[PDB]
């Protein structure tokens, strides 16, 4: 039986340039390419993109942050292109040391460049957030994507903005290296007792696992009912066919309750969004409220002794 995992025969007509629903067309590029290796899995069209004020500004600020991280790597390699490549994952642009507190007076190669890059990184993610909002607004769509992105941004900002301010030191923000930010994560768990005994870290993991499991379930369900017009999820929300019914009856017979075509996406939205929302809460409480989650768990009756 055909498993709808890969397309068998690809087809292509005139390239699709998008819906016009209040988008400024002069900010939308005009060139599309049609790349058939992608058409085995999904769409083949590498479509146009929209480039307006917010996107341009976000790209400029983010690219400058990226550039500044790179330049710091070059300088700490003592200019060597060999060390630069050998340490592309092991090097990091680190925040100022604890003695500088939250002041903006730390040497340029000991946190100052970290501060400047961090400022421009902050600017670009917020501008990208505004972009996600405004692209929905220009098409007349709801704002669910921007809200979901706000949750992930909330974890990001508690990581490097909110919590270091509440702790009184930039030195607790995460550095900009591939391996050093993993080292940062490990150190963070090690200094706050053990982050497994942080209930919001537990809840964040539950929502991460659940969102992975949920989208295994949902992708498998839609693929299983693809024989019927299944993946046309919109228009099954407003005109229920057998794909939606059989999808509902599978899960009802299996676990005793089911979702609807529209409502499974609310479950997934909330499970995905709750992972960084709950995670940010648990990091924010670490150090500020609880210093040692292990003894806190012992006091609150979920760690023995």
């Amino acid at each position: 039986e055909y498993q709808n995992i890969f397309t068998q025969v690809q087809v292509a007509g005139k390239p699709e340039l998008g819906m016009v629903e209040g988008v400024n067309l002069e900010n939308r590029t005009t060139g599309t390419t049609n790349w058939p290796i992608l058409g085995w899995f999904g769409n083949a069209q590498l479509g146009p993109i929209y480039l307006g004020t917010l996107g341009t500004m976000s790209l400029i600020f983010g690219a400058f942050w990226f550039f500044l991280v790179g330049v710091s790597f070059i300088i700490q390699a003592d200019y060597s292109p060999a060390l630069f490549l050998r340490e592309l994952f092991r090097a990091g642009l680190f925040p100022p040391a604890p003695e500088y507190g939250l002041s903006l007076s730390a040497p340029l190669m000991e946190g100052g460049l970290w501060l400047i890059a961090s400022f421009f990184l902050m600017l670009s993610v917020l501008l990208w957030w505004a972009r996600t909002y405004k692209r929905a607004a220009d098409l007349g769509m709801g704002k669910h994507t921007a809200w979901a992105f706000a949750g992930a941004l909330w974890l990001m900002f508690v990581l490097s903005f909110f919590r270091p301010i509440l702790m009184g030191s930039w030195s607790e923000a995460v550095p900009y290296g591939i391996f050093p930010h993993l080292d940062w994560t490990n150190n963070f768990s090690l200094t706050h007792g053990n982050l497994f005994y942080n209930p919001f870290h537990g809840l964040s993991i539950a929502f991460l696992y659940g969102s992975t499991m949920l989208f295994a379930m949902h992708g498998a369900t839609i693929l299983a009912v693809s024989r019927l017009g299944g993946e046309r999820e919109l228009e099954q929300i407003v005109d229920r066919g057998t794909a939606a019914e059989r999808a509902a009856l599978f899960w009802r017979w299996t676990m005793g309750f089911n979702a609807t075509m529209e409502g499974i996406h609310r479950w997934g939205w909330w499970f995905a969004v709750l992972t960084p929302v709950t995670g940010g809460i648990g990091i924010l409480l670490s150090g500020t409220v609880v210093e040692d989650w292990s003894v806190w768990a012992q006091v609150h009756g979920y760690k023995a002794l």
Partner: protein
């Protein structure tokens, strides 16, 4: 010269946005660089000058 022909090439809106962005970036970066150096950090300089001011 007659540089005005530049506005025949580029849309003024994009130019103004880009130019404001780069000016803002430049000013922020210079001010933060001066604050990072303890010879041009004016807050701390004043603190020392006026015996805590």
């Amino acid at each position: 010269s007659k540089f005005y022909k530049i506005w025949l090439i580029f849309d003024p809106r994009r130019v103004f946005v880009a130019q404001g962005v780069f000016l803002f970036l430049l000013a922020v970066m210079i001010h933060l660089m001066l604050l990072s150096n303890p010879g041009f950090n004016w807050l701390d300089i004043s603190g020392v000058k006026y015996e805590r001011v």
